[PDB]
Amino acid sequence: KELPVVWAQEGAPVHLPCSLKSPNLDPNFLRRGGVIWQHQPDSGQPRQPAPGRYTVLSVAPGGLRSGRQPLHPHVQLEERGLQRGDFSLWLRPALRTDAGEYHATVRLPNRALSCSLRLRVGQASMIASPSGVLKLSDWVLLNCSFSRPDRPVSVHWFQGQNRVPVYNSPRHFLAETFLLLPQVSPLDSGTWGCVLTYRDGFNVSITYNLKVL
Amino acid sequence: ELPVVWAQEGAPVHLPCSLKSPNLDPNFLRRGGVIWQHQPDGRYTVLSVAPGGLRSGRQPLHPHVQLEERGLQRGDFSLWLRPALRTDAGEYHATVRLPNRALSCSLRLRVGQASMIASPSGVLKLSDWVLLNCSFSRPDRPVSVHWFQGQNRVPVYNSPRHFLAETFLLLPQVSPLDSGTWGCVLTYRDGFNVSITYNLKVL
Numbered sequence A: 001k002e003l004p005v006v007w008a009q010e011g012a013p014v015h016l017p018c019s020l021k022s023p024n025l026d027p028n029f030l031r032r033g034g035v036i037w038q039h040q041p042d043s044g045q046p047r048q049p050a051p052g053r054y055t056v057l058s059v060a061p062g063g064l065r066s067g068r069q070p071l072h073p074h075v076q077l078e079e080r081g082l083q084r085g086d087f088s089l090w091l092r093p094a095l096r097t098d099a100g101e102y103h104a105t106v107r108l109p110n111r112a113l114s115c116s117l118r119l120r121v122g123q124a125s126m127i128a129s130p131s132g133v134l135k136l137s138d139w140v141l142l143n144c145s146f147s148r149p150d151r152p153v154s155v156h157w158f159q160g161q162n163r164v165p166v167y168n169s170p171r172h173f174l175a176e177t178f179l180l181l182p183q184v185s186p187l188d189s190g191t192w193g194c195v196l197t198y199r200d201g202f203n204v205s206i207t208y209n210l211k212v213l
Numbered sequence B: 001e002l003p004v005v006w007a008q009e010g011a012p013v014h015l016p017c018s019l020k021s022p023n024l025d026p027n028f029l030r031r032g033g034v035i036w037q038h039q040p041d042g043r044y045t046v047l048s049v050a051p052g053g054l055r056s057g058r059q060p061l062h063p064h065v066q067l068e069e070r071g072l073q074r075g076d077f078s079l080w081l082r083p084a085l086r087t088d089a090g091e092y093h094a095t096v097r098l099p100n101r102a103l104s105c106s107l108r109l110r111v112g113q114a115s116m117i118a119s120p121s122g123v124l125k126l127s128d129w130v131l132l133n134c135s136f137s138r139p140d141r142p143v144s145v146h147w148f149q150g151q152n153r154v155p156v157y158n159s160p161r162h163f164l165a166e167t168f169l170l171l172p173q174v175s176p177l178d179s180g181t182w183g184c185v186l187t188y189r190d191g192f193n194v195s196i197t198y199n200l201k202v203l
């Protein structure tokens, strides 16, 4: 079977999970764990060479840090989690170039274990048809879109400073990932927002400023 | 530099090359010969007809490139690409040989992609709304947009049941009379036309 896929939104932090799910307390045993995170970027794809792997993070087992600064400072580890057996990678800005395979090797006192993921990075946008700048009483269709190919499981719409929930109503028709405003009014000018949730739990938050003249 | 000719991928296009005021005998101008060269974006000849008025008969041969012999008799030596393909973009050079006259033509062909974007893009239920976008990949924006409905291509104007804005057509409430083909024509400032058809399916 293939690698589990983790999705990221470009510009937003992402968390690549690698965790002992049954840590039997013992913060003093799991203090002493260390991990190597390696990244296999996409070659793009006969008698081919094997894909290359380079180390993006290394923290030493034993319960100490050596004073070595991070090699790739946008890639990070939460050091509070190591006591709980959490060796997950944080990509502070998830970048397009960060896509590819991630391989963790964790060395504890008695054993070593591995974690393997494929990270894909997508782009979010509110697509406005005909446009975002509108005239009074025009119609507009907003699509809460993300470049992931599959269909999200839920879409939540919000409007205004305080994120007031937006439901199917006479002034707002909701269908799939789309919100149709049949007749914009002065109260429709301002910020709108959406949250897309996919079946793997990945969710995207998108904001957009509608202008009505 | 060169005149630009636009093409829609999947639709025929003709690269114009016509004698200015070509009113000679239709059997005199058929006896002309022409060479069309394409340097893709390495000049190579894509079709050559020899002067003298006789043919090799290989018109089914390479039918993606063609000359219309009615235009050849009318002094029109234009190249026809029956499916305009992505590979056809690039530089074109025509040379036409008559007994006492010569002509050369130089054009740049760019090919764009057309699509009817439907939101939502599936099959629709009666009384749903739907938005159609007549889109073309050309960078400049078209100067006019025309919408048509049905096999008989009846024009569609701004109304309560069909709202037109820019390149978009909104149908607020589909009915069984909306089932079937819809079409749009984009017209650009040079006269280039893009025709897109779309089959709406509604239960």
Ligand SMILES: *[C@@H]1O[C@H](CO)[C@@H](O)[C@H](O)[C@H]1NC(C)=O
Pocket: A127, A143, A144, A145, A146, A147, A148, A149, A150, A151, A152, A177, B117, B118, B119
């Ligand atoms: C609208 O957004 C959804 C979610 O990303 C996407 O699957 C769909 O293709 C988009 N459609 C248009 C017309 O933008």
Ligand SMILES: *[C@@H]1O[C@H](CO)[C@@H](O)[C@H](O)[C@H]1NC(C)=O
Pocket: A195, A201, A202, A203, A205
């Ligand atoms: C997305 O899912 C995560 C995981 O449960 C959750 O913490 C987050 O709150 C969800 N999205 C939003 C917009 O809150």
Ligand SMILES: *[C@@H]1O[C@H](CO)[C@@H](O)[C@H](O)[C@H]1NC(C)=O
Pocket: A127, A128, A129, B117, B133, B134, B135, B136, B137, B167
């Ligand atoms: C709709 O089509 C026009 C014409 O090419 C294009 O400029 C515009 O970006 C398209 N918008 C959407 C949402 O498809």
Ligand SMILES: *[C@@H]1O[C@H](CO)[C@@H](O)[C@H](O)[C@H]1NC(C)=O
Pocket: B146, B185, B186, B187, B192, B193
């Ligand atoms: C291009 O399309 C427009 C609108 O349908 C039409 O008026 C015009 O005559 C067309 N041009 C040609 C050369 O057919």
